[PDB]
């Protein structure tokens, strides 16, 4: 329940930054495999689950087409429907 | 008659060289600028020689060796380099002071480059054009952490704080678990209720993200403890003036793991919607970002439940739709906001009264209205 609530809160802080004009929504769609590696290994994912979490991230960034401030919600829901937090502590 | 006094070297000046010296008569010997009388290995303040009966002077001619300003003074939190011949402290030698950047910064006067240039003057002391014998002063930088937190936030959020993200965060264990921030190299900013709870061994730790390591990094004893007079320990409902300062017995040596935090300057840091980090412990240091909320939407939420003391010297941050807890920050810790223009970190708030440690808004102590009090206790 920690992972789920934390990701909800991060996505909703991103939506607030979007509403204030501090973050561009299209920019969130850009992340490298190196950056995914870093974020997944720092928070503590299984090195075997790295590529699976990356698949989830790419599929959820692709599934959303709404480039408004609500995308951060939708992507989050996708992350929860793909069960990303089962890969995280 | 006695021989004409001839100098041993060249830097010696025979004051009034008389064509010949008879008995009873004398002469004196002085040097040029940046030179001193020696005679062997001693240092003479003056030399005189009398024509002692026969053709002899009662004491031989001295030599004017070069003055040595000695080893330059150690610059606290700084150092120096020789611009002339290295290791030479003699006359007409120059040095360049510099502070341990990016941690400390030499004070300016408006004036640079030539600021830390000291030379070995004729009096045997290290002086300068502007300012005489006094050495420069390395001043600490407030914000500017070596390893600032990443600004590109992701949904895949890592709530674990790394080394250097919060170099000002400190750890206190007075009546319970607490914390605060660093001001300069000697002062600690925290909340007053961590000192005088509403219901003392102090114990201040700092310099790492692991709780086990903070305690391994040694204690930091305290001298004076200045609690703001508006705080009432007995009133277990009003945290007005919930702010205090702590002066360390000894100053700390700043580094990438330990840097101060800036004080607010203008009220634009409190505009609605500004994002601010609060860091706290449980066994390790975690951080969460919270938006500053409407000061009116928090009062309606407050009075709507059960009466508290939301004043103008306070402000609220957070949002109900967030799934975090209202007690997510750490007691006495500062509400850290970064200025996106100057990229410095200011402590706009202090974790004060968090009603309902479960879910909802969070209240803090507005530091801006208390800055003048903080600068008063520190400068003393």
Author numbering:
A (entry chain A): 24 to 112
B (entry chain C): 308 to 417, 420 to 508, 515 to 597, 605 to 628, 630 to 703
Manuscript text:
Whereas previous studies on salivary gland extracts from the sandfly Lutzomyia longipalpis identified SALO (salivary anticomplement from L. longipalpis) as a potent inhibitor of the classical complement pathway (CP), its precise mechanism of action has remained elusive. We found that SALO inhibits the CP by binding specifically to the zymogen form of C1r. We provide two crystal structure determinations and supporting functional studies which show that SALO binds tightly to the zymogen activation loop of C1r preventing cleavage of its scissile bond. However, since the C1r zymogen undergoes autoactivation over time, we expressed an engineered fragment of human C1r consisting of its two CCP repeats and its serine protease domain, wherein the catalytic serine (S654) had been mutated to alanine (zC1r-12SP).
To further investigate this modification, we crystallized the eSALO-Y51F mutant with zC1r-12SP, collected X-ray diffraction data extending to 3.1 Å limiting resolution, and solved the structure by molecular replacement. After completing model building and refinement, our final model had Rwork and Rfree values of 23.1% and 27.8%, respectively. We found that the eSALO-Y51F–zC1r-12SP structure largely mirrored that of eSALO-WT–zC1r-12SP. Although the contributions from the sulfate modification were expectedly absent, many of the interactions present in the WT structure were maintained. This included the hydrogen bonds formed by D32 and the salt bridges formed by E58 but not the hydrogen bonds formed by N33. Overall, these structures showed that sulfation of SALO Y51 promoted interactions with residues sharing the scissile bond of the C1r zymogen, but that sulfation was not necessary for SALO binding to the C1r zymogen. However, we found that the affinity of eSALO-Y51F for C1r proenzyme and zC1r-12SP was diminished 7.5-fold and 8.2-fold, respectively. We found that eSALO-E58A displayed an IC50 value diminished by 14.1-fold, whereas eSALO-Y51F was even less potent with an estimated 171-fold loss compared with eSALO-WT. At the functional level, this modification appeared to result in an ∼8-fold gain in affinity for the C1r zymogen and an ∼170-fold gain in potency in CP-dependent hemolytic assays, as judged by comparison of eSALO-WT and eSALO-Y51F.
